[model samples]
Structures are given as C-alpha cells and as structure tokens.
Target: HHHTDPMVSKGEELFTGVVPILVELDGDVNGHKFSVSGEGEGDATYGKLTLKFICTTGKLPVPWPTLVTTLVLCFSRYPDHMKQHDFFKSAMPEGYVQERTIFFKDDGNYKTRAEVKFEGDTLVNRIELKGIDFKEDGNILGHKLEYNYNSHNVYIMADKQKNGIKSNFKIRHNIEDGSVQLADHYQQNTPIGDGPVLLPDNHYLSTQSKLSKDPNEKRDHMVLLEFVTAAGIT
Candidate 1:
C-alpha cells in the first residue's frame, strides 16, 4: 500500500521521546512521491514542531490528505513523544498552540504546505498552512489583532486555479472549538464544519493504512504510508 523511507536523519535527540529532532523522508502514498522535512525544537517549557511537505508528483488539498498523511508518517517515526500532547487528544487544550501548558508549554506547532511539480523541476500550486504565532498577530505577520489561541490559517495561491483569475482562497481552523471557516478572495468568512479532522489515538506508524476511502477516487490524490525508521541512518 503506502510506505516511507528516510532520505537522511539529522538533529539532536533533545528529549526522551523525541529523537532525531530533524529528519527528511521519502514517501510513496496514494501512488505519488513525497519528500517531507520536519523539525521539532524547544522543550517542556516551550517547543515547536514543524513539517514541510512537498508533493513531488501532484497537488492535493492543503491539509486534507497531504497534511494528514505527513502527520501520520511523522508520528510513525516518533510516536510516544507525540502522544503526550493535547491537540492529539480528544480534549482540546486552551492555548495558542495545541500543547499541554504545564508540560508542553501548552504550546505546539502544526502546519501544512503543498505544491505541484512539473517536468524538469518546475514547481507550482504552492500553499502555506500555518498557525499564527505570538509574533504574527499585528505584531508581525500583519494579521488583525483578534487572534484566537487555537487557530490555523490555510492560504491557497493563484496557481492552484486553472486560469489564475479567482483561485485564491483562505481557510481558518479553530481546533480549540472544533470549527473550520473558509473565505474566498475579498469575501466574508463562512463556517464549513463543526469539527477538525484528526487521526485516532490507535493510529501508529507501524500500522498499515487502513483507510476507508477508495484510493482511485479523484479526491483521493494521496495514499497513506508507514515510515521505515530501522534502516540506514544519515
């Protein structure tokens, strides 16, 4: 079905559960090639976990299959260390990031990125999904000051659309309240759903992707994969 191989391993094993703090992996999910880079920094007081996902084959929805798949693989590589968080739990934690405050700084980092690749290394259809940080609200990223503690932003570039005329869209996710909002360019924000999509606690890296959706479906642009962490280390 789906599988992943590490291209290289780097960074320090800063904590008991978190090792190989930074890593690069090659994956085949939903029949496409993907390269993912991840970095986890900080500690119990405060920490940040980031993932950069590159679809070397085609462009899929930002956080849907792409984001979810990347998180799955990342978790497979490092499991127990991640389960100690709140966002990953059924109960949402009240913090800027989805981490446990007393132990996780209640601060967490979960973001998504997407891109379409063309022949000869040309890339397009780039998307950036990120959680607005403390330095981003009016203080930095030029966003309004009304920042929610548990919110993430998804931005789709013009290239994602065929003609590039009206393809841009903005999506805001408030996982704390379990709601997702969507907005077009110069349009009002509208609610889309009442909950955020999260993988279950039983999901483990070693488990095969037992997805319900048919991989052949048009919307199913990606496949689920397990990362091979016992091979060569670089």
Candidate 2:
C-alpha cells in the first residue's frame, strides 16, 4: 500500500478556486499617515496566495515601497476511515513526531510538526514552530499554534508562552460575505492591534490569516489557511 492516498488527492481538489480581494488600508499610526492599497489573489488548489501591497507614506502621497510576498499554506488530510490512533502511529513513526514544512515563495521556509489530537470532541490540529533562519534569536522553540473547528464554531490559539495571541473566531460555513468574524472574546496580539481579518467574502471556507511578528524588526508574516471554496475550481 505504497500508493499516494486518494484522500490527499481529493483533498487537493477540495480547495480549488480563484477568489480575489483588495488589501486597501489607509490609516494613521504614530502621528503618521500611511496606506498599503493593493490586490490579493488566492489560489486554493495549490494553496498559494500572492499579496501585492503597495505602500504610500506622508500627506503628499509619495510611493514608499511595494511589499509583495507569495505564500503557500497546505495541510495533509487525516483520512476519515483510518482510526485516529492508527493514523497518528503512521504519521508519527519516530518519537511520536512528524516533521512538516511551510512554504514561503520569497524567503526561507519555516519548519513545524504534524501534531494532531482530540480535545474533548473536536479534532485539534497543532504545530510546534521554530525561528525561521534569523540568527539574532538564539533561544526559540515550542511555540504552540493550534486551530480547530466544529460545525458552527472555530477556535484559534497561539501560545508563545508569556504573551500569547488568543482569538475566538467563529465561522458560519455559509456563502455570506461575512462568514468569518470575531466571536465574543477575540485578542489580537500585534502592534497594529486586532486583525489579519479577511476582506469581504473573498477567502474560502474556514479561511484565516494569523500574524506573527519578527523579533528584531517589527515586520511580520502570518499563518494562513484557505481551505475548500464554496465552488470547487477543479
């Protein structure tokens, strides 16, 4: 049974579609006005997203820079027919850990683990991440990142130990332009405060973008998920 699992093949097609959104931002921070209005396109089949953000600073509308990055967020499926214990045993054949990698189109890729478990009745998906090739930080390990969802609810947790980023976002799984929103208690741990929010209804089902900041510089990246679209592309 060394063939490629059909479940994964089906999972690949499950998230196919092309939905675009505008990343229009105009705001004031630290007594300075800036804007990064651009376009974002999501290709769910390949799990690739390209954000071409053009930034402008000052009142004169001078072009500052265009920050562009293409990122890939993908997940290997947990087959329904396979028992949880058996699946874990196979995935984690060594030391109860499976090494996984996240792809970055323009930068060094970060590494994580394929960790899955059940908390109560929900299937909790998790990963432990390390710093991404930046030599400044010597000690970086065990950043707990998890997201799990049920029929009507989705919960996300980012525990970096001391000051963790916590959010209780919800998903309705419908085609409404506002399918994903912050639930009762949503804590966005960033200098920009609350966000990585989706624009309109462009993103697919159970889609989210969680920000992760760089320690040396305040520039940040995100953990994104763009799953099965309402209409499958291929």
Candidate 3:
C-alpha cells in the first residue's frame, strides 16, 4: 500500500523551477509588454532562463501570430513536468460546478485530485476532481491530468479555471521517491542574485535587454535562470 498526493501544506509556499518570464514590447503590432514570473525553489525541477526581444522605430523582427498565442499566455497556470509533449491537445477554459460526477476510467474521465493534509502541524490541500461537468463557454474536456510530489517542500495553489478541459490536461506521475538535495535560489535583478545559474561553452548569462521602465523606451523581455549541477548534463 503506497499512496502519495501531498500538494504542499506546511508553512505553505514552496515554489519550484517554474521559470517563465517573457517581456517583449516595442510598439504597434506587438502584444505590448509582459509580466510573467512564477518564481522558484523548494526543489526546482531543472531551470535556467534568459530572454529579451527589443523593438522600436523600425519594427520587423518577425515572430508574431501572437507569438505562440502569447506563449500560451505564459504557462496560464500550474502545469509542468514537461515530457512527451508535441502540440496541443488543447482544451481548458471553463467549468465551476454541475454536480453529477464520476466516470469509470479510461474513458468517461474522472480522477483529478490534489492533496495535502495535516492540521496539528498545519498543512492542508484537498482539490479533487472526478469527471468534471461543464457544457458552455468554449467548453473543452478529456480529463487525464495527475501529479504527486511528496518532497522538497511541495507547491501548488491553483484555481485558474475550475477543472475540465479534461479535468485539466494530461499528467499521471504517481510517485517514485523524490531526491535531489542541493538547492540555492533568489532573483529580482542583477547584483541581487542568489540562484539558478550554470552556463558555459559559449557561456551565456547576460543582462540589459529591458522590458519596461517606460519613458517612450520600453523594449522588454530580459530575465535569467539556468540550473544544472551535481555533475550531470554536459
């Protein structure tokens, strides 16, 4: 008997390697500025990022079509464990409650639970979804999302659209004992450094790309994070 589903609860806040901060703006035709920062630590699952695309008077860097729908509006919400992904099975943007729930499995769809419990010590998270119900407003469903991280601090506090879109898109990583002890993190801008950085071989990790300060000069998309230590990935 082995059950794992502790979605963080113990002094709360245990974010990890979410890394996504794109801010590219120059003017017309552009989506105009960005502000996406998921912050990390607590067992960041691989990270290291740097981005900045400026634009101005000339404007013609090419890469718009909503730039991947604004980079899927930058993560949209808690969803990662990037593996075996190749193009949207896209569906998620509706539902709040209907009542009738529970579908067998392998079809009818059901089974989307987020957990964490402990009161004496203090920590509680119980978000369960079993074959959700919703029919309207660009409704999309298929259900198959799952996750269970029982270590390094735990993190998750999402509500960005109540289930459905198949209970919240594909994922089912039961559990398998987690490990990786060697964490260091911090961020807010240069000289204010503290975590996620390790790049060599052409060596990358620059600064000054500017996202916004406004004044008429607002070319943005400058952020950084790169992780890889404990002797791996060369």
Candidate 4:
C-alpha cells in the first residue's frame, strides 16, 4: 500500500495555516488520516465554499502524453461553450464584459468569463472558467474547474430584521482507486451591526487600510477553512 501518513500530514498543514481563522472557529475541522469533513454558517445565504485534494504517487496509470492531449482538446473548446450566454453582450462596473474560451497550453494558461443580470434592485451573478489545468511531469493531473451561480436575493425587510447566514462546506480527496477521503467542516456567524470589525495586524492591512478607520469595515460576516498536511518532494 502507498504511504498515506506523510501526505495526510502535509495536506493538513497546508490547509490549517492558509485557511482563515473564522472558518476553523466555526467548526470546519474534520478528517482522519485520509478522510474529509467541514462546516460553516451563513454559507447558503451568502455563498458556498469547497476544497479538494488528491494524493498520488509519481507514476500514473495512464500515459502522460495521452492525458496532456486530452486536456488540450478540452481547453480548445472553451470559447465555443461561452457563446451560449447573452450577458456577454453588455457592460458593467468592472469593464466591458467579454468572454473567451481557450484550452490549457503547455504553459498552463487559462481564461474566465462572467454573466451578470439585474432584476429590479437585486442582481444575479454567474461566472464560469475553463482551462484551469494542472500538470505533473508532462502529464495532465486534473483541473481546478468550477461554476459559480449566485443571486443578491437577501434584502433587509425592516430595520430590526437582522439576517443570520449559515453555510455548509465540504472537502474531498480522491484516492488512486477512486475511493474518497473526507474532512470535517466548521461554521461561524457575525451579526451585522454598527461597530468596528477587528482583524489581525499585518503589512497587508497596513497598506490596504491606510485610507480609512477600518478598511475591512464594509462587511461584518465571513467564514474560514484550514487544512493540515505533511510536506514532500513531488
């Protein structure tokens, strides 16, 4: 059997430090050596988050050239798929909205597009990206692909109607045999009220927040996720 202990430790470390504290505090800590679990509040109302990790030995069952060729073909068709959206014909706050679909080249380059629409005062945002390909030793391992569809559906009905948001997040790692490892998830919530939000002191905050009392004061709710894993020479 392949050694799972080292990879598991490395993955845990990678996540535990990189993930935000709010997520861990909310209870997103779940996993045994090669397992999965995570949780959070305000996820369904605000947004949803997911993270996946797969461990494999240096040798792959499939030929590297075949996988690479397949990835190239898949990426080449990205632009054609984007033409199905109508929102690409308009302009928005960021810039003139444009869509391009392309394939992942040897250099691992990719592109993304967004479709946004407004229904009255509420707005809906849908974003999809293609060509997020990852490679190892000239072989295509997988792709970090995703589709995000969300709507600004929540509005304050009255002054006293405070919205309480909750979320459920999951992380999965596919083993070589197609078995899955899971991790425990955590959740957290913050009430939106009139107060200064607190954050850790760092250089990023210093430069970014120099202009105002609290540069991160716009929103009062957030969730964080952390995973711990071992390190290795891959």
**Number of the top-ranking candidate, with lDDT as the measure:** 2
CA lDDT of every candidate = 0.26, 0.29, 0.22, 0.22
Sort every candidate by lDDT, greatest first: 2, 1, 3, 4
- Score candidate 3 by TM-score against the native: 0.17
**Deviation (Å) of 157 in candidate 2:** 3.3
Candidate topping TM-score = 2
Clashes of 3: 13
Alpha-carbon shift of residue 95 in model 3 (angstroms): 28
Better of 2 and 3 by lDDT: 2
Over 1-234, each residue of candidate 3 has an lDDT whose tens digit, in order, gives 111322221111222334333232222212223222222221223323333333333433222211211211112122232211101111111101212122322333233233222223222222333323322221112111111211122111222233221111111222123421121211111111222111111111111111222355444322222232121112
Residues 122-153 of candidate 2 have per-residue lDDT tens digits of: 22233333324422211111111122222332
Candidate 1 is scored at a TM of: 0.22
TM-score for each candidate, following the candidate numbering: 0.22, 0.26, 0.17, 0.19
Q: Who is ahead in TM-score, 1 or 2? A: 2
What are the RMSD figures for all models against the true structure?
20.2, 19.4, 22.4, 23.5
